[PDB]
Curated annotation (Swiss-Prot):
Protein's job: Responsible for the cleavages located at the N-terminus of the replicase polyprotein. Participates together with nsp4 in the assembly of virally-induced cytoplasmic double-membrane vesicles necessary for viral replication. Antagonizes innate immune induction of type I interferon by blocking the phosphorylation, dimerization and subsequent nuclear translocation of host IRF3. Also prevents host NF-kappa-B signaling. In addition, PL-PRO possesses a deubiquitinating/deISGylating activity and processes both 'Lys-48'- and 'Lys-63'-linked polyubiquitin chains from cellular substrates.
Name of the protein in its database record: Papain-like protease nsp3
Subcellular location per the Swiss-Prot or TrEMBL entry: Host endoplasmic reticulum membrane
Domain of life: Viruses
């Protein structure tokens, strides 16, 4: 049993809810929250900008030190950093950004990072301002992630379309 509440069960291991991932993280304090990161860990907008704002910019300060030491992530890659006030850990995962022309086949590689964690609170990778089709992102998630993933979807309209169209 875990603390997640109000989710619709899609599969053995994938759950979904219409929720603000920031408000959900603050309530649950999950072991892992996933950030929709870019390779520079520049948390300007979308999910990343909202998570970083909720940490009072401490996520960005920590991320700038990570990049200064290690250099940029790979598209499809990830790193584990602090969850600050939101979670124990933040898994920063880089899905491909269609608005930069990145290979959508890298979305499966991105979701494979989730398999290193038994339970996660996450957004749909490459959705929103990363430009991919969220229906596609949910299908790759279900077909790639084997650990228990609790997906938070920001737009109610999109949430209802994801559920209604789910095979
Ligand atoms: C495009 N996309 N992908 C995921 C989501 C979301 O609401 O989580 C969205 C979205 C859709 C409409 C407005 C805002 C976000």
């Amino acid at each position: 049993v875990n603390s997640f509440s109000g989710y619709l069960k899609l599969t053995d291991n994938v759950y979904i809810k219409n929720a603000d991932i920031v408000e959900e993280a603050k309530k649950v304090k999950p072991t892992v929250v996933v950030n929709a990161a870019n390779v520079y860990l520049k948390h300007g907008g979308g999910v990343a900008g909202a998570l970083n704002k909720a940490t009072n910019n401490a996520m960005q300060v920590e991320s700038d030190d990570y990049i200064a030491t290690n250099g940029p992530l790979k598209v499809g890659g990830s790193c584990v950093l602090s969850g600050h006030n939101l979670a124990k850990h933040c898994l920063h995962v880089v899905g491909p950004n269609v608005n930069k022309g990145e290979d959508i086949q890298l979305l499966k590689s991105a979701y494979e990072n989730f398999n290193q964690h038994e339970v996660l609170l996450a957004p749909l990778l490459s959705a929103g301002i990363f430009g991919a089709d969220p229906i596609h992102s949910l299908r790759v998630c279900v077909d790639t992630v084997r650990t228990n993933v609790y997906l938070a979807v920001f737009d109610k309209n999109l949430y209802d379309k994801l559920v209604s169209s789910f095979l």
